[PDB]
């Protein structure tokens, strides 16, 4: 590497020393990609080795085995695991690919070309070359469009993706006729983010999921070709700061928005994150508590429709803010919860009193593991449910884990976006190091009063 | 001055304020703990408690805090003060609904 006396950056800012070094920058990127794939393979092998087959895939602290299981690799009808060989194959393939990527990153970091323009003009790039940066962005956009179309191919032709909304409690269901309706997809993307709708966490079916993926893959490929064959317009030139730090800040803001968004998928979505693999969401186990106590107390003999609580609102059933019949407990906030074990019990007006009395299914009754433990409580050092629970059961929800972690890292990346956006603006302006001390701007301004 | 409206103009006053604020805060808290040493506590608001005593509708977050303090005392004293030998049964301890 280099020292501070030449680069001007200290050791705790050493990665800035390779801002203008294309080959070393590429080597750092490839080594980091090797790190990501190494974590994927190693953590996959760890979760496979620490997998007990009789338990569901959430009492064991497994977060990414559900990610493979959602694709339909080794998943039975009801949600059983059948075999762990696809998970093992994924882990081993990731480990070997990470070995290759780590070798390439180490090579380009240590003995690769220091700067790429003098020998490899296709890969050489200056940060002020807008056409070259849009070319690289177009290559990556086409790659991401192919990646989304890969999931589309898996859903459509390779007999995959697990549907929770399939009758009987879900099944690995090959998806036919995905909804490619532009009105539906963009009404998903432009709607309110609050409780009534949810902006992006509202997908209740794999048909809309795969239609949106078709749209995003086609758009990404087309935008990649567009960026390959265009140059940014003068309004974009006047609006953006064209430097490697500013581009990083743009990526940081976008990826922090993605981190918050993924935290919200993890907490609320039960379609792209099946309950059989990720445990209950926030709204369920709370809806399940009211549902199971309703069916238990009507199994004893007491009617649930005409039973009122201490406040006179209904111990089991009440009305929502809109006239829908919902569960009468404190779970009136979670009345928007849609689950595979609720919808056949639910009708047009409300919760279908007659269906609650007669048309309850034994599998919906057996789905009380949702309620029993596994409500997304759990404490930091494991232990059971609420903070006042005793050391009885070893469980924290995977949804809780990868929602909390993802919100933390999303907020940190928003902070990093702020830092890098400010420093990029100060670098383009010329005062990243401070004030010139002989002509400061303040002395050229009139005093406020 | 253009962000907050007011700003420091003297480093003397800036650093004296930086000295002054935590010392004054800690001294006021020390005086409060001295007041608590003799159980001379600002526990209640008499007007609020009389209003809520004659009104079954009047509730505030302060009344909620008073109710929470009662539960802290009742459910904490038995295992907190073993000298008092408080073998209180569970039914005389206060409870809400269902918890």
């Amino acid at each position: 590497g280099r020292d501070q006396e030449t680069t001007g950056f200290a050791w705790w800012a050493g990665n800035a020393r390779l801002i203008n070094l294309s080959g070393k920058l590429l080597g750092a990127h490839v080594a980091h990609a090797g790190l990501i794939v190494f974590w994927a393979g190693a953590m996959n092998l760890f979760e496979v080795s620490h997998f007990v087959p009789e338990k569901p895939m959430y009492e064991q602290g497994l977060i990414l085995l559900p990610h493979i299981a959602t694709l339909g690799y080794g998943v039975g009808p009801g949600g059983e695991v059948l075999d762990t060989f696809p998970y093992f194959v994924s882990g081993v393939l990731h480990l070997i690919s990470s070995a290759v990527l780590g070798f390439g990153g180490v090579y380009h970091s240590l003995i690769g070309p220091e700067t790429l323009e003098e020998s490899y003009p296709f890969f050489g790039y200056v940060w002020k070359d807008k056409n070259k940066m849009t070319n690289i962005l177009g290559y990556h956009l086409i790659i991401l469009g192919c990646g989304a179309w890969l999931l589309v191919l898996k859903a459509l032709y390779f007999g995959g993706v697990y549907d929770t909304w399939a009758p009987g409690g879900g099944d690995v269901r090959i998806i036919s006729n995905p909804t490619t309706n532009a009105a539906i997809i963009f009404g998903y993307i432009v709607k309110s983010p609050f409780g009534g709708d949810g902006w992006i966490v509202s997908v209740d079916n794999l048909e809309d999921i795969i239609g949106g993926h078709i749209w995003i893959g086609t758009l990404c490929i087309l935008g990649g070709i567009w960026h390959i064959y265009t140059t940014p317009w003068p309004w974009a030139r006047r609006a953006f700061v064209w430097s490697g730090e500013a581009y990083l800040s743009y990526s940081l803001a976008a990826v922090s928005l993605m981190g918050f968004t993924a935290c919200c998928f993890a907490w609320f979505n039960n379609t792209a994150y099946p309950s059989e693999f990720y445990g209950p969401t926030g709204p369920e186990a709370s809806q399940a508590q009211a549902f199971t106590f309703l069916v238990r107390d009507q199994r004893l003999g007491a009617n649930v429709a005409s039973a009122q609580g201490p406040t006179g609102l209904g111990k089991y059933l009440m009305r929502s803010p809109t006239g829908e019949i919902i569960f009468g407990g404190e779970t009136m906030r979670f009345w928007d919860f849609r689950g595979p074990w609720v919808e056949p019990l639910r009708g047009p007006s409300g919760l279908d009193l007659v269906k609650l009395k007669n048309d309850i299914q034994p599998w919906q009754e057996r789905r009380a593991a949702e309620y029993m433990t596994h409500a997304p409580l759990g404490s930091l050092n494991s232990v059971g449910g609420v903070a006042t629970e005793i050391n009885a059961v070893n469980f924290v929800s995977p949804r809780s884990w990868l929602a909390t972690s993802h919100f933390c890292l999303g907020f940190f990346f928003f902070v990093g976006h702020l830092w890098h956006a400010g420093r990029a603006r100060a670098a383009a302006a010329g005062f990243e190091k401070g004030i010139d001390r002989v002509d400061e701007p303040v002395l050229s301004m009139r005093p406020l009063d | 001055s253009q962000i907050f409206g007011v700003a420091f103009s003297n480093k003397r006053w800036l650093h004296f304020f930086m000295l002054f604020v935590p010392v004054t805060g800690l001294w006021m808290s020390a005086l409060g703990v001295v007041g608590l040493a003799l159980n001379l506590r600002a526990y209640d608001f008499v007007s609020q408690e009389i209003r809520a005593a004659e009104d079954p509708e009047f509730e505030t977050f302060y009344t909620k805090n008073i109710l929470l303090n009662e539960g802290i005392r009742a459910w904490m004293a038995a295992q907190d003060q073993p000298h008092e030998k408080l073998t209180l049964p569970e039914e005389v301890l206060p409870r809400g609904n269902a918890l």
Binding site: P447, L448, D449 | G5, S9, N10, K11, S47
Partner: peptide, 30 residues
């Protein structure tokens, strides 16, 4: 009165901070 005294004290504090923001002494020496 009860609420009137609280309202008067709050708007007095707000008027004080408004005067401090706008009708302050102009800053001198740095």
């Amino acid at each position: 009165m009860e609420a009137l005294v609280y309202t008067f004290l709050l708007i007095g504090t707000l008027g004080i901070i408004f005067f401090s923001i706008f009708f302050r002494e102009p800053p001198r020496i740095a």
